[PDB]
């Protein structure tokens, strides 16, 4: 009955509800272009659901030795993020009709973010934890650079409802993604300052907002209709 359980339970509920709602809504859409966004965006909280549920049940948790202590690390988060973060970038890329090469590069930079963040979460040499964290944060900053300079630029050729929706999602994304590396740095994977219960509450708010909040905004806009 670990104290962070409550936040995993509430994350499981919120992700489950969001998945359902988005499914119900997506089932009623016939527009070809809109259906693709629904599929992708319903899949995202679905995957987060399974991983929050897993973590609630005590899977995806391992102890890593570093700084003279056994430290609890939820690796299940990375299995979620490995698929969900590129799917959220895909939403944004299809919105602004980004080029296939840009999408490859993003997904590739995202895989590297997640994978190097994983390696760092599992690293036993304390200082090497932060080498992997820095490389991960670099890859995240490449992504955000691309969203902000590349996509915004592209979105500016599009219809106003597309440009407006993109900007909102881009802003939500940059604010919430940028908070992840900070939480990791001060939390249990990092400096150990913020306790695991509070850290789990923080990832909860950020994940729900970055998937369900993002989703509500995207799927209720007129921008997804071709």
Ligand X SMILES: *C/C=C(C)/C=C/C=C(C)/C=C/C1=C(C)CCCC1(C)C
Applying CB under 6 A, which residues contact ligand X?
A: 81, 84-85, 88, 113-114, 117, 133, 136-137, 140, 177, 180-181, 184, 207, 210-211
Binder among 24, 104, 182, 217 for ligand OCT (CB under 6 A)? 182
Q: Does 71 bind ligand OCT (CB under 6 A)?
A: no
Q: Under the criterion CB under 6 A, does residue 187 sit at the interface with ligand OCT?
A: no
Q: How many CB atoms are closer than 10 A to CB 178?
A: 14
- Judged by CB under 6 A, the chain residues 17 through 46 that form the site for ligand D10 are 36, 39-40
Q: Is position 165 an interface residue for ligand OCT (rule: CB under 6 A)?
A: no
CB 88 within 8 A of CB 211: yes
Q: How many chain residues interact with ligand OCT (CB under 6 A)?
A: 6
Residue whose CB is less far from ligand D10, 83 or 148: 148
* Cα 10 from Cα 95, distance rounded (Å): 30
- The partner in contact with residue 202, picked from ligand OCT, ligand X, ligand D10, none with C-beta cut-offs of 5 to 8 angstroms by kind, is none
Please count the helices (runs of H) and the strands (runs of E) in the chain: 10, 2
Nearest distance from residue 181's CB to ligand X, in Å?
A: 4
Q: HSE on the CB side for 84, CA within 13 Å? A: 27
> Which single residue is written with the structure tokens 């499914």?
23
CB 192 within 8 A of CB 71: yes
- If binding is defined by CB under 6 A, does position 141 make contact with ligand D10? yes
Taking Cα atoms as reference points, which of 223, 222, 219, 226 lies closest to residue 37?
A: 219
Residues 183 and 193: their CA atoms lie apart, in Å, by: 10
CB 142, min distance to ligand OCT, A: 12
Instruction: Name the residues that contact ligand D10, by CB under 6 A.
Output: 36, 39-40, 94, 101, 104-105, 108-109, 138, 141-142, 144-145, 148, 168, 171-172, 174-176
């Amino acid at each position: 009955g670990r104290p962070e359980w409550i936040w995993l339970a509430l994350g499981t509920a919120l992700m489950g509800l969001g998945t359902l709602y988005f499914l119900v809504k997506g089932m009623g859409v016939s527009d070809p272009d809109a259906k693709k966004f629904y599929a992708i965006t319903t899949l995202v909280p679905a995957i987060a659901f399974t991983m929050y549920l897993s973590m609630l049940l005590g899977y995806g948790l391992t102890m890593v030795p570093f700084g003279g202590e056994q430290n609890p690390i939820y690796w299940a988060r990375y299995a979620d993020w490995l698929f969900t973060t590129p799917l959220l970038l895909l939403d944004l890329a299809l919105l602004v009709d980004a080029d296939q090469g840009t999408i490859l590069a993003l997904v590739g930079a995202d895989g590297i973010m997640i994978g190097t963040g994983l390696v760092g979460a599992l690293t036993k040499v304390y200082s090497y934890r932060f080498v992997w964290w820095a490389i991960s944060t670099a890859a995240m900053l490449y992504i955000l650079y691309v969203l902000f300079f590349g996509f915004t630029s592209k979105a500016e050729s599009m219809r106003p409802e597309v440009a407006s929706t993109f900007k909102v999602l881009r802003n939500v994304t940059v604010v919430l993604w940028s908070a992840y590396p900070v939480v990791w740095l001060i939390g249990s994977e990092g400096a150990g300052i913020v306790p695991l219960n509070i850290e789990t509450l923080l990832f909860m708010v950020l994940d729900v907002s970055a998937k369900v909040g993002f989703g509500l905004i995207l799927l209720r806009s007129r921008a997804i209709f071709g």
